[model samples]
Target: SEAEDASLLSFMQGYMKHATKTAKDALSSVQESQVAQQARGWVTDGFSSLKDYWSTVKDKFSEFWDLDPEVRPTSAVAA
Candidate 1:
């Protein structure tokens, strides 16, 4: 169990490291885009609305399930 715990910790750390790098790249691209600077206000406004909609959906799912959406429970009786 100790070995499994260490393995799980290492796996999470590695996963987050890669995921964080990807997120940073996305942030940099959005910030550095030249066209994005002069784009119409509606474009930004629409994106804001989309973001708000998804946020509400995420909240609803979290409240309804009260469990991690990414996790799965083991079979009680293996087939």
Candidate 2:
């Protein structure tokens, strides 16, 4: 069970990193330097928020990774 939890967290973290890179690439493609910079900052801020929230969740709910996906609440509900 712990292995499964660790694997799931690792997968989610890796996906998040990939998604961040994708966002950074898309934002960097913008022609305007200012716009691109601001967009990238926004994306980074979003992921930072996610990381902070994830840390809180991991700390507050020790059994978070143990729960079944079907029963776990959606982001909407969690928010």
Candidate 3:
């Protein structure tokens, strides 16, 4: 069961890293320097998404920690 938890964490970490790159690319794509600098705000904005995703993952993990080591539907896990 721990392996499954680790797998989920790994997936989320990889996904979050990709999301960060996407945000960075979007920030760098702006034409104006000032606008691009402002767009850099998306780093945290994007991090917020990571936070959200991680939150969901964490809840599932916590449930796994507390509940029986059986496959549970993540959708009903409640964020």
Candidate 4:
């Protein structure tokens, strides 16, 4: 029982030690890589486009419901 518990604890300790080191290695590598830079720009652009689309959709819905006051329609009505 002593041998079993001792080795199990040893394995757990070693596993956590290695995992911490591996995670830090990956963190630094990815943080400095060009892919990280590109990914951040891509993510920012995605959010910007997403917000633009969301705002336009909200404006259209508000117009349809006639909820937004003071905003005039841009579409011309033909006779």
The per-model lDDT (C-alpha) reads: 0.68, 0.73, 0.72, 0.70
Using all chains and alpha carbons, the TM-scores for the candidates as numbered come to 0.27, 0.26, 0.26, 0.31
Clashes of each: 0, 0, 0, 0
Candidate 2 regions with alpha-carbon error over 4 angstroms: 1-5, 29-79
How would you encode candidate 1's per-residue C-alpha lDDT over 13-37 as one tens digit per residue? Answer: 8898879888867887875566655
Better of 3 and 4 by TM-score: 4
Residue 71 of model 4: what lDDT? Answer: 45
Query: Candidate 2: worst 10 consecutive residues by lDDT?
Result: 67-76
Q: Candidate 4: misplaced stretches above 4 Å?
A: 6-10, 36-47, 52-79
lDDT of 4 by residue, 17-68 (tens): 8888888678877746667668677786675886778889888777766534
Stretches of candidate 3 off by over 4 Å are 1-5, 31-79
lDDT of 3 by residue, 19-74 (tens): 88787778888646678766677886674787778889988887656654644677
Residue pairs with backbone overlap in model 2: none
Query: Residue 44, candidate 2: how far off, in angstroms?
Result: 34
**Predicted model with the maximum TM-score:** 4
Clashing pairs in 3: none
